[PDB]
Design a protein around this ligand. Structure first.
Ligand code: YET
Ligand code: CA
Ligand code: NA
Lengths: 84, 238
């Protein structure tokens, strides 16, 4: 079309429809990463459980349903410069 | 703080100030929650009685928005050692809770392992306080902040006349005239990660301020996260 990598689907000015776990224009980049790369996509804390990333948050945040983002529980969560 | 710049409105909201019998600031602190302040153990021995002021930006005027809290419990690290300043850390529980507001907000305590690999491996942290704006000058009436490069442990040790324990780190400049100073002790050293500031150090000691060949010495907060959690678990009186 073999430009799409890691069993990605090629269409066409070609496009790649990547398998889950892969990204980039040609599905050449693993989305699955440990904490050493982009903080494992965690907003705050990152730690590994069995070759897998688990994100967490500091006091006055809850972990979003997506398991990456940290949601404040009020207007004064820790570590944010105060806007108002 | 020698060099650096004044904190703008809301920029350094976790700064606390320890004020003595005369209501003069003598050391800094970091707000950790409504009831808890992080400071240096050595500061405790430098005033007969003390209280904690939060939300102060200029000490010369009562701008409003400042609050003074009385200390309920002083939790000095029992291993604090006077001749080395090893274990230079203390937590204070306040009698009345801090009302978080503009310029008054807690800094985050990081997870230990993540802090080691993600915060301590950054180029810089930020130190702040009301301390002397020069080694030979006078204490600032205005809260200042200063970005300080992390210095590797070996360079830290060989720069210093005195022992650098594993519970200390160096931060600052070799010859550039920017440092923390006297009066900043106890205050925050924080490291930013994705727009969120985490407590990484406590202003501890140094030879002079902004001396050539010397750095600022900070209590290494990662060594003490477990101890801080335990001190904060106590909560109020039974
Ligand atoms: C990061 C940081 C730089 C820094 C510089 C400081 N400046 C000074 N002195 C001056 N001009 N600190 C002295 C204060 C006088 C007492 C001696 N002292 C303690 C000291 O020298 N120690 C050696 C090992 C254990 C303690 C200081 O830190 C104080 C606190 C500081 O915190
Ligand atoms: Ca004031
Ligand atoms: Na220096």
């Amino acid at each position: 079309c073999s430009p799409c990598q890691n069993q990605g689907k090629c269409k066409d000015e070609y496009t790649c429809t990547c398998l889950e776990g892969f990204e980039g224009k040609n599905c050449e980049l693993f989305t699955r990463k440990l904490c050493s790369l982009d903080n494992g996509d965690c907003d705050q804390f990152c730690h590994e459980e069995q070759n897998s990333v688990v994100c967490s948050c500091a006091r006055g945040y809850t972990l979003a349903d997506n398991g990456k983002a940290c949601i404040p529980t009020g207007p004064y969560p820790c570590g944010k410069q105060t806007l108002e | 703080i020698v060099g650096g710049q004044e904190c703008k409105d809301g920029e350094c909201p976790w700064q606390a100030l320890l004020i003595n019998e005369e209501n003069e600031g003598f050391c800094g602190g970091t707000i950790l929650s409504e009831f808890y302040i992080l400071t240096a153990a050595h500061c405790l021995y430098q005033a007969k009685r003390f209280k904690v002021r939060v939300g102060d930006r200029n000490t010369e005027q009562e701008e409003g928005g400042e609050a003074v809290h009385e200390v309920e419990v002083v939790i000095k690290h029992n291993r604090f050692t006077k001749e080395t300043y090893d274990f230079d850390i203390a937590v204070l529980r306040l009698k009345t809770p801090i009302t978080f507001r503009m310029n008054v907000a807690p800094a985050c305590l990081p997870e230990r392992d993540w802090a080691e690999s993600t915060l301590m491996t950054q180029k810089t942290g930020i130190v702040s306080g009301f301390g002397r704006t020069h080694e030979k000058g006078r204490q600032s009436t205005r809260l200042k902040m200063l970005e300080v490069p992390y210095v590797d442990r070996n360079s830290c040790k060989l720069s210093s006349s005195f022992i650098i324990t594993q519970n200390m780190f160096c931060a600052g400049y070799d010859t550039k005239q920017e440092d923390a100073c006297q009066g900043d002790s106890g205050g925050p050293h924080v490291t930013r990660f994705k727009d969120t500031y985490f407590v990484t150090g406590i202003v501890s000691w140094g030879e002079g301020c902004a001396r050539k060949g010397k750095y600022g010495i900070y209590t290494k907060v990662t060594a003490f996260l477990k101890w801080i959690d335990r001190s904060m678990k106590t909560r109020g009186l039974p």
